[PDB]
Amino acid sequence: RPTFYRQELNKTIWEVPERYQNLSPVGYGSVCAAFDTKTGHRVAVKKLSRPFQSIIHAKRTYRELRLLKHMKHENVIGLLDVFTPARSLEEFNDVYLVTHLMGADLNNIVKCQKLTDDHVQFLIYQILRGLKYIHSADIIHRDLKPSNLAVNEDCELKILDFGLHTDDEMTGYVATRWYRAPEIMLNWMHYNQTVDIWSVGCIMAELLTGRTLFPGTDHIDQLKLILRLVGTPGAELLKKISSESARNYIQSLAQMPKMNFANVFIGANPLAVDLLEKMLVLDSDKRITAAQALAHAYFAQYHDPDDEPVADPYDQSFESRDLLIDEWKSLTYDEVISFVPPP
Ligand SMILES: c1cc2c(cc1CNC[C@H]1CCCO1)OCO2
Ligand SMILES: [Cl-]
Ligand SMILES: [Cl-]
Ligand SMILES: [Cl-]
Numbered sequence: 325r326p327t328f329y330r331q332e333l334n335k336t337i338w339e340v341p342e343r344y345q346n347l348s349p350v351g352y353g354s355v356c357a358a359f360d361t362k363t364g365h366r367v368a369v370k371k372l373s374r375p376f377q378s379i380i381h382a383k384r385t386y387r388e389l390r391l392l393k394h395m396k397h398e399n400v401i402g403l404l405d406v407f408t409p410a411r412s413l414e415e416f417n418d419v420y421l422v423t424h425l426m427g428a429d430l431n432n433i434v435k436c437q438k439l440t441d442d443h444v445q446f447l448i449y450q451i452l453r454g455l456k457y458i459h460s461a462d463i464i465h466r467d468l469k470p471s472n473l474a475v476n477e478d479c480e481l482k483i484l485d486f487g488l489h490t491d492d493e494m495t496g497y498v499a500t501r502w503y504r505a506p507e508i509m510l511n512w513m514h515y516n517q518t519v520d521i522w523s524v525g526c527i528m529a530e531l532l533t534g535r536t537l538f539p540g541t542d543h544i545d546q547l548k549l550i551l552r553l554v555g556t557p558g559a560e561l562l563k564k565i566s567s568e569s570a571r572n573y574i575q576s577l578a579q580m581p582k583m584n585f586a587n588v589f590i591g592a593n594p595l596a597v598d599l600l601e602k603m604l605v606l607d608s609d610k611r612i613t614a615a616q617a618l619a620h621a622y623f624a625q626y627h628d629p630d631d632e633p634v635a636d637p638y639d640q641s642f643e644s645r646d647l648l649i650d651e652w653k654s655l656t657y658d659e660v661i662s663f664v665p666p667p
């Protein structure tokens with residue numbers, strides 16, 4: 325067990341191993357930047373806030389730690405370390421997570437740069453490479469958007485901040501909803517991993533035009549923007565919407581055909597237009613998958629089917645388990661103490 329040292333930074337006590345130096349606040353928890361003297365990396369250290377205050381919160385803490393421990397891929401955030409100052413389960417209260425410190429996100433590039441078509445190819449390729457890996461473990465990200473994509477000076481990209489949101493966070497003119505698939509925005513049906521491909525379509529469109537694709541001022545305004553582009557649903561999709569009320573509302577709207585995407589994404593690579601038409605499909609059964617998209621001709625310069633790995637199997641059966649707070653806490657403690665760092 326390492327030696328820990330204590331300090332107070334912005335009204336919070338931080339107790340961390342000596343290897344982490346020069347802690348400096350930066351931002352579910354509080355976050356500091358630090359220098360990891362064991363690896364030489366600049367890191368983010370996150371101290372969870374009240375990780376075990378309720379059954380819901382204790383299960384959420386376990387879910388986050390299980391997910392971060394599993395993710396081992398070049399285009400996905402990984403876990404560098406996890407620690408607690410507690411010396412036994414009986415005194416276990418605090419959990420700290422350590423990841424690589426991320427600089428700019430895709431917003432700090434989309435808003436503040438000039439992107440060639442080659443940049444768009446490389447950025448979207450990496451998102452899809454990470455998503456092929458995530459989806460192969462039957463994990464759904466659910467919250468893909470530019471602020472959850474880290475990008476460095478060399479255009480290298482990592483997916484972070486998995487969906488692990490409130491009614492109010494999704495209300496109004498807010499980026500937290502602009503990238504969401506319509507079937508989850510309006511609770512049309514049980515969703516699956518196809519929702520992430522809708523989000524990639526929204527992101528790719530924005531890289532090509534420099535503008536948000538569907539910046540709705542509320543749920544209904546956003547739906548109207550979506551249906552104007554991709555057309556109103558036919559009877560085949562309407563059958564799949566479980567809410568009689570949602571079905572009723574959709575049928576109240578005048579019917580519209582799918583638009584010509586070459587006349588929307590003016591001047592874009594025709595192969596980019598084609599791929600957008602295959603991602604931004606209203607019926608989620610018919611969207612292209614991540615594995616299929618990697619083989620699309622838009623990515624011919626980067627696609628390598630021998631360098632696009634899948635994930636180890638991921639057991640999520642705990643999600644249907646009904647446990648007490650102390651049982652979730654004990655499960656989390658076991659995962660902290662069994663952590664093995666990466667090479
Ligand atoms: C307005 C009208 C629309 C629409 C989306 C919008 C709002 N975003 C503007 C465009 C700039 C090119 C792509 O995003 O989809 C169908 O009609
Ligand atoms: Cl140490
Ligand atoms: Cl990483
Ligand atoms: Cl503790």
Ligand SMILES: [Cl-]
Pocket residue numbers: 431469470471472499
């Ligand atoms: Cl964002």
Ligand SMILES: [Cl-]
Pocket residue numbers: 582583584585587
């Ligand atoms: Cl058109």
Ligand SMILES: [Cl-]
Pocket residue numbers: 460461462636637638639
């Ligand atoms: Cl799996």
Ligand SMILES: [Cl-]
Pocket residue numbers: 637638639640
């Ligand atoms: Cl597993």
Ligand SMILES: [Mg+2]
Pocket residue numbers: 471472485
């Ligand atoms: Mg985020």
